[PDB]
DNA sequence: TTCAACTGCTTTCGCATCCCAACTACTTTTCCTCACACTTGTACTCCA
């Protein structure tokens, strides 16, 4: 069975309101082990296995 | 002694006007490159 779900970060967002959030990591300002899941740029490596609780972006 | 509006009730889990942008314009930011009018002698004879 396969689901796909739309992350979206805009969803809050006015139209006049500027860009607030940002996909990635931000520096100095670090929990570990969402790495074992997620890449440099804040986006899964595909085929990962994951469970509910686990990090699906950063 | 009756007509006509005001009346709460059908199930049982879980499903399910303001802003932004476009392209083409015109403009400013300055820094770099020279000319244009003025003047004393000297030169060529000038009139004595």
């Known amino acids: 069975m396969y689901k796909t779900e739309?992350?979206?970060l805009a969803l809050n967002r006015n139209r006049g309101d500027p860009i607030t959030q940002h996909f990635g990591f931000?520096?100095?300002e670090?929990?570990?082990?969402?790495?074992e899941?997620?890449?440099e740029?804040?986006?899964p490596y595909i085929g990962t296995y994951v469970e509910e609780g686990?990090?699906?972006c950063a």
């Open 6 to 8: 739309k992350v979206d």
């Open 41 to 43: 740029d804040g986006l």
């Open 54 to 56: 686990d990090p699906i």
């Open 26 to 28: 931000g520096n100095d």
């Open 30 to 35: 670090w929990p570990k082990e969402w790495l």
């Open 37 to 39: 899941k997620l890449d």
